[PDB]
Design a protein around this ligand. Structure first.
Ligand SMILES: C[C@@H](N)c1ccc(Br)cc1
Length: 118
């Protein structure tokens, strides 16, 4: 059975290397596909800086900090929040980055997270 939270180490990708720049065409689809790729180990993370989001496809899936009181074992506790046309679906803390499919790109780092399964 799946636990409420899972430890994952996500590959951090540079935006210009990403081949598949989003998970789908609707808020519900991108959240669904992101969660599936997270379970399969085929999800990467792009850190948000100026210029990044316009190079990626909407809707966006962000991982955001869900608890600022403790980060177990160095894994920041995080949850998913989607965004389309300036409207967010969920409310959470600070953005760690935007999730994208990982299809073999070489990462620049790994980001340890404790992901809320839902
Ligand atoms: C199964 C593999 N060909 C693949 C499917 C969808 C996405 Br998104 C990335 C890779």
């Amino acid at each position: 059975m799946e636990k409420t939270h899972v430890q994952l180490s996500l590959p951090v990708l540079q935006v210009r290397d990403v081949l598949v720049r989003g998970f789908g065409d609707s808020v519900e689809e991108v959240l669904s596909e992101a969660r599936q790729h997270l379970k399969d180990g085929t999800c990467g993370l792009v850190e948000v800086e100026k210029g990044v989001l316009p190079q990626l496809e909407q809707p966006y899936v962000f991982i955001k900090r869900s608890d600022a009181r403790t980060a177990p074992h160095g894994h920041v506790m995080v949850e998913l929040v989607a965004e389309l046309e300036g409207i967010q679906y969920g409310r959470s803390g600070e953005t760690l980055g935007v999730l994208v499919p990982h299809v073999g790109e070489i990462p620049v780092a790994y980001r340890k997270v404790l992901l809320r399964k839902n």
